Amino acid sequence: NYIYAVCSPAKFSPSSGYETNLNSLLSSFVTSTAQTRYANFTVPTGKPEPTVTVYGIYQCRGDLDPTACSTCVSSAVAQVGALCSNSYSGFLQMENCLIRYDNKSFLGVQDKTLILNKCGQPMNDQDALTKASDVIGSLGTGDGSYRTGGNGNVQGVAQCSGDLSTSQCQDCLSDAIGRLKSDCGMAQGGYVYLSKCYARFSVGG
Ligand SMILES: *[C@@H]1O[C@H](CO)[C@@H](O[C@@H]2O[C@H](CO)[C@@H](O)[C@H](O)[C@H]2NC(C)=O)[C@H](O)[C@H]1NC(C)=O
Ligand SMILES: *[C@@H]1O[C@H](CO)[C@@H](O)[C@H](O)[C@H]1NC(C)=O
Ligand code: NA
């Protein structure tokens, strides 16, 4: 029910303020999905406190209705505890949403590092190869932080973490889409997840 989880080696102490603030942060994510598909939070609210302050975001796919966004984020919160347990930093990516938290702010910090890239099996079908090429490339020329394109039965999606600037988003996506095309462009789908953005496509289904 998830794509990847990243959990820091460094752990907070049991029943510490950090743990308590994290749990409060995560509950806040769920609440916030009623209003918006992306939000950033600090707990506690106010001046950073040594050790215990938590920073986080959630982000739903850019076309999700609030009900679908709540369901996804709730599930992410329910899963991240099991996977990341007492890590200071946790990042859980699902198909339709992510949650991310850390013990320092990561807002507006570019990070194009690769997390996960998987390609499908290979597609003489120049129609299919053309469509895939055109769809994947269309994601790069598209605007803003959530981009989709489709031709026939070929569908592409690209999304930047909501904290990135316009420029940072395009830079991240340029990399992700470049990798997606270069490595998976002849395949029956594929996905590239970088730290702060992703690009993916599917053929059929
Ligand atoms: C976030 O958590 C990490 C891990 O506790 C902090 O890094 C540690 O900092 C302490 C003292 O400040 C050092 O004794 C450790 O060597 C560090 N550990 C690691 C793995 O780097 C980091 O300072 C915390 N950041 C904030 C802003 O609280
Ligand atoms: C984070 O949230 C604050 C307060 O809600 C807002 O002022 C700011 O624009 C947000 N920043 C980012 C990078 O998401
Ligand atoms: Na969509």
Author numbering: 30 to 152, 155 to 236
What do the authors of the reporting publication say about this deposited model?
The Domain of Unknown Function 26 (DUF26; Gnk2 or stress-antifungal domain; PF01657)18,19 is an extracellular domain harboring a conserved cysteine motif (C-8X-C-2X-C) in its core. The third class of DUF26 domain-containing proteins is the PLASMODESMATA-LOCALIZED PROTEINS (PDLPs). PDLPs contain two DUF26 domains in their extracellular region and a transmembrane helix, but lack a kinase domain. We defined the structural relationship of tandem DUF26 domains by determining crystal structures of AtPDLP5 (residues 26–241) and AtPDLP8 (21–253) ectodomains to 1.25 and 1.95 Å resolution, respectively.
The PDLP5 DUF26-A domain is N-glycosylated at positions Asn69 and Asn132 in our crystals. The N-terminal DUF26-A (PDLP5 residues 30–132) and the C-terminal DUF26-B (residues 143–236) domains are connected by a structured loop (residues 133–142) and make extensive contacts with each other. The resulting ectodomain has a claw-like shape with the β-sheets of DUF26-A and B facing each other. To assess the functional roles of the invariant disulfide bridges in PDLPs, we mutated the partially solvent exposed PDLP5Cys101, PDLP5Cys148, and PDLP5Cys191 to alanine. While the wild-type PDLP5 ectodomain behaves as a monomer in solution, the mutant protein tends to aggregate in our biochemical preparations and display reduced structural stability in thermofluor assays. These experiments and crystallographic data suggest that the conserved disulfide bonds in PDLPs and potentially in other DUF26-containing proteins are involved in structural stabilization rather than redox signaling. Despite moderate sequence similarity, the overall fold of Gnk2 and PDLP5 DUF26-A and B as well as disulfide-bond arrangement is conserved. Notably, Glu130 and Arg132 implicated in mannose binding in Gnk2 are replaced by Asp131 and Lys133 in the DUF-A of PDLP5, respectively. Despite these structural homologies of Gnk2, PDLP5 DUF-A, and PDLP8 DUF-A, we could not detect binding of mannose to isolated PDLP5 ectodomain in vitro. We are also unable to detect any binding of other water-soluble cell wall-derived carbohydrates to the PDLP5 ectodomain.
